[PDB]
Design a protein around this ligand. Sequence first.
Ligand SMILES: CCOCCOCCOCCCCCCCCCCC=O
Ligand SMILES: [Fe+3]
Ligand SMILES: [Fe+3]
Length: 221
Amino acid sequence: ALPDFTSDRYKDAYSRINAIVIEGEQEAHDNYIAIGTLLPDHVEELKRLAKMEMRHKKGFTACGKNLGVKADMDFAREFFAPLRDNFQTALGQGKTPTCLLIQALLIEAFAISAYHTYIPVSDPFARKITEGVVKDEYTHLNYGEAWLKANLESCREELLEANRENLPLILRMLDQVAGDAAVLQMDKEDLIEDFLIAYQESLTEIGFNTREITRMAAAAL
Ligand SMILES: CCOCCOCCOCCCCCCCCCCC=O
Ligand SMILES: [Fe+3]
Ligand SMILES: [Fe+3]
């Protein structure tokens, strides 16, 4: 059944969830602009994708305002800190495949799963915004997916290392927010299932086989 969107219990859990989604969108904008320094020939497409995230950030900001909820931005900044730190380290080292696996694959699959799970349990205002985010988010092949498919043979080992370091951070992020997600009527198992399917699909597209993907998904533990 649908949660009571007016209760203090819902508003409290929404304050952290909403803030995480808002921060995720801001960091996605910053990340695609940062990737532009590593891929100067991709600047215009990256600027277009960065503008999409700011549109989503504004949409999700309005979701919190509509419910009369103040987003806990400090919690959101700390929530993203381990993953943000690893992105910055890869960026400074000029590690384009790592930067792309973090933002274009892991964060996008994390967002897709979250949005798909939230839609059937969301309030009418937030439902239209979220459905609008999914039915617009991107093209057939993502700036990262397509890039990683084209450059796989030169970056296979870096991708396996990036997955090993960053996939457990995504797992820990979900564990940290599973309680608040449950208040919003979202099942943790539905979030895990959807994320793994979306991540498996992108890896298959890039060029990894069943055995390689199995080994990669196993890095989460
Ligand atoms: C391996 C287990 O990990 C599964 C993670 O499932 C996803 C759970 O996410 C629920 C928290 C909601 C946060 C959404 C993040 C929004 C980020 C938007 C950035 C856009 O590019
Ligand atoms: Fe987004
Ligand atoms: Fe995105």
